[PDB]
């Protein structure tokens, strides 16, 4: 349904073992399209899909420099956090940020978001109003006072309502080919003779886009997620996604079980049996 533009920043302090590492990745829905990494041999903002390269040189110039500034500010913020939590200058630490915007049907902001984590735990988050902040602890409260004084929420709101959705609108036409078409899953059921008191039924979903999907198993109509193994959705490596759901059934009751697949690329809920 809704389309999104999102950026993910990771900053890793390597304390007196170098300089701070910074990597940024950009996504339009579940498709990555740019990347920057300052531990890379030659840090530059690079394309990662074909369509994004039909952009001009000005784009790569602006984006490269902007993320290069952001990386230095994050190297600063890592040591600021170091101080807030009163931590030593020797152990490595992590600062993550994710932000982005979802487009409504009208072509304007449905909702925007911006959240940070320090060492894998919630730090500070912009609330859905794009005007107030939720701080997880009293160090994030220091950061929140700073951002209240600088009226930072208004800066983020201006970005999320303007440049974010405008960039997303343009990206959604440069990559019209693959961004605005859904790929339904290619599904099949696999049988494994495990023992003589159980065979394993595996329901596969391959080559689907976007990432969200529902895979469940039923017997004569009732759900069996209570005894079902469900792997985390994983990338195929070509921009699509894979998943499977397996369960143990008695030998001879294979037809008694059905796999149910739900995905926006399908016209109606899919049902599957081992054949």
């Amino acid at each position: 349904g809704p389309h999104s533009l999102s950026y993910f920043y990771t900053a890793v302090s390597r304390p007196d073992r170098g300089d701070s590492r910074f990597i940024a990745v950009g996504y339009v829905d579940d498709t990555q399209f740019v990347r920057f990494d300052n531990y890379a041999p030659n840090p530059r903002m690079e394309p990662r899909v074909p369509w994004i390269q039909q952009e001009g040189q000005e784009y790569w110039d602006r984006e490269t420099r902007n993320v290069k500034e952001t990386a230095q500010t994050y190297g600063v913020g890592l040591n600021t956090l170091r101080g807030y939590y009163n931590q030593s200058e020797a152990g490595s630490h992590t600062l993550q940020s994710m932000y982005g915007c979802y487009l409504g049907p009208d072509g304007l902001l449905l909702h925007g978001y911006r959240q940070d984590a320090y060492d894998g735990a919630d730090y500070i988050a912009l609330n859905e109003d794009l005007r107030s902040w939720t701080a997880a602890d009293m160090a994030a409260q220091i950061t929140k006072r700073k951002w209240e004084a600088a009226d930072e929420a208004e800066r983020r709101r201006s970005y999320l309502q303007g440049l974010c959705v405008e960039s997303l609108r343009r990206y959604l036409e440069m990559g019209k080919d693959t961004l605005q078409r859904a790929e339904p899953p290619k599904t099949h059921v696999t049988r494994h003779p495990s023992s003589d008191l159980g065979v394993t039924l595996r329901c596969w979903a391959l080559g689907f886009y976007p990432k969200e999907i529902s895979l469940t198993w039923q017997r004569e109509g009732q759900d069996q997620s209570q005894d079902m193994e469900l792997v985390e959705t994983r990338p195929s490596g070509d921009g699509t996604f894979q998943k499977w759901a397996a369960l143990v059934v008695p030998p001879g009751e294979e037809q008694s079980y059905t796999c149910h697949v739900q995905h926006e690329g399908l016209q109606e809920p899919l049902t599957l049996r081992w054949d």
């Binding site: 950009g26 984006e63 600021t80 950061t143 951002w147 600088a150 800066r155 960039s167």
Partner: peptide, 9 residues
Amino acid sequence: MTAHITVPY
């Protein structure tokens, strides 16, 4: 397009 960083932590 990425956002400009406007505040420190």
